[PDB]
Design an enzyme around this catalytic site. Structure first.
Site, PDB file in Angstrom:
ATOM      1  N   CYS A  19      38.478  48.578  30.304  1.00 18.13           N
ATOM      2  CA  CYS A  19      38.725  47.331  29.521  1.00 18.13           C
ATOM      3  C   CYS A  19      37.997  47.219  28.211  1.00 18.13           C
ATOM      4  O   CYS A  19      37.825  48.380  27.844  1.00 18.13           O
ATOM      5  CB  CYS A  19      38.150  46.200  30.490  1.00 18.13           C
ATOM      6  N   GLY A  76      34.397  48.485  28.741  1.00 20.99           N
ATOM      7  CA  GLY A  76      34.155  48.865  29.985  1.00 20.99           C
ATOM      8  C   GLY A  76      33.061  48.488  30.814  1.00 20.99           C
ATOM      9  O   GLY A  76      32.398  49.346  31.491  1.00 20.99           O
ATOM     10  N   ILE A  77      32.763  47.353  31.037  1.00 23.87           N
ATOM     11  CA  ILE A  77      31.756  46.684  31.652  1.00 23.87           C
ATOM     12  C   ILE A  77      32.297  45.440  32.447  1.00 23.87           C
ATOM     13  O   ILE A  77      31.893  45.528  33.556  1.00 23.87           O
ATOM     14  CB  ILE A  77      30.397  46.446  30.950  1.00 23.87           C
TER      15      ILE A  77
END
Length: 272
Positions: free
Chosen positions: A203, A206-207
């Site tokens: 995304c 990335g979290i």
């Protein structure tokens, strides 16, 4: 118990030993979407075999997530990290990519397009990608990609990109059925491919959404192995993934969505 309470406290201080130095290097500044969201050094994906003219070519904002099937949690590509993303997919032998965002949401770039259009091919540095076929499902699109290193056709492998398209622009989906169906497909594809590497999930940072998808996948895999009666501990799972990439699962709605997803999955098993 005293042993339990103290051990729990002690485990919480381990993260003081982690560093994020590689991501803070001057040469890597333009490779991070968010200056404050950086990979832990000890789990980062280290890229070998980069352009020797580049002083630092071993960095991508991504970490391996091993439950303790594995994952790579990464940010959506920037215009300048597309070649790095494909180097990572090749090196790690990843055969499945989960894209959890649109390219653009609410006027913001979440991911630069890193795949060719259907029936086309593109070279991304030393990597050649061909998009053989796309299939549009209700909630997602599947792209059958063929990835190879230029001048080495024998290295070609199929990489299946599962692009989730209907996650809402604000908050989370109000029902988990679409996500679970998607994840069931990703699971069956990965298990079908001998020696497949980690599943890539991304995304914009990335979290948040990445973490939500990974944590759900891990938990439903436990239910597959151990049955609907098995013990599930959502906070301990989030702590385990956060030991490998900081901040995974960013909002309370995401957190509630994980619980809802697991329960929905269990109820599907009871219905089927």
């Amino acid at each position: 118990g005293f042993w339990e309470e103290f051990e729990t406290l002690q485990q919480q201080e381990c993260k003081l030993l982690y560093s994020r130095k590689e991501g803070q290097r001057q040469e890597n500044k333009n490779k991070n979407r968010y200056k404050n969201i950086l990979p832990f050094d000890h789990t980062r994906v280290v890229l070998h075999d980069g352009d020797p003219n580049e002083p630092v070519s071993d960095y991508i904002n991504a970490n391996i997530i091993m439950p303790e099937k594995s994952y790579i949690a990464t940010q959506g590509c920037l215009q300048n990290t597309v070649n790095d993303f494909w180097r990572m997919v090749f090196q790690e032998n990843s055969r499945v990519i989960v894209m959890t965002t649109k390219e653009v949401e609410r006027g913001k770039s979440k991911c630069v397009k890193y795949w060719p259009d259907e029936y086309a091919l593109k070279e991304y540095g030393v990597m050649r990608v061909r998009n053989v076929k796309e299939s549009a499902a209700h909630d997602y699109t599947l792209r059958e990609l063929k990835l190879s290193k230029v001048g080495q056709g024998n290295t070609e492998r199929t990489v299946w990109q599962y692009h989730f398209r209907t996650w809402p622009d604000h908050g989370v989906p109000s029902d988990p059925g679409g996500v679970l169906d998607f994840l069931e497909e990703v699971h069956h594809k990965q298990e079908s491919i001998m020696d497949a590497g980690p599943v890539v999930v991304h995304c914009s940072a990335g979290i948040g959404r990445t973490g939500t998808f990974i944590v759900i996948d891990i938990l439903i895999d436990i239910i597959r192995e151990k049955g609907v009666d098995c013990d599930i501990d959502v906070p301990k799972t989030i702590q385990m993934v956060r030991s490998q990439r900081s901040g995974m699962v960013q909002t309370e709605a995401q957190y509630r969505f994980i619980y809802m997803a697991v329960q929905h999955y269990i109820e599907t098993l009871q219905r089927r």
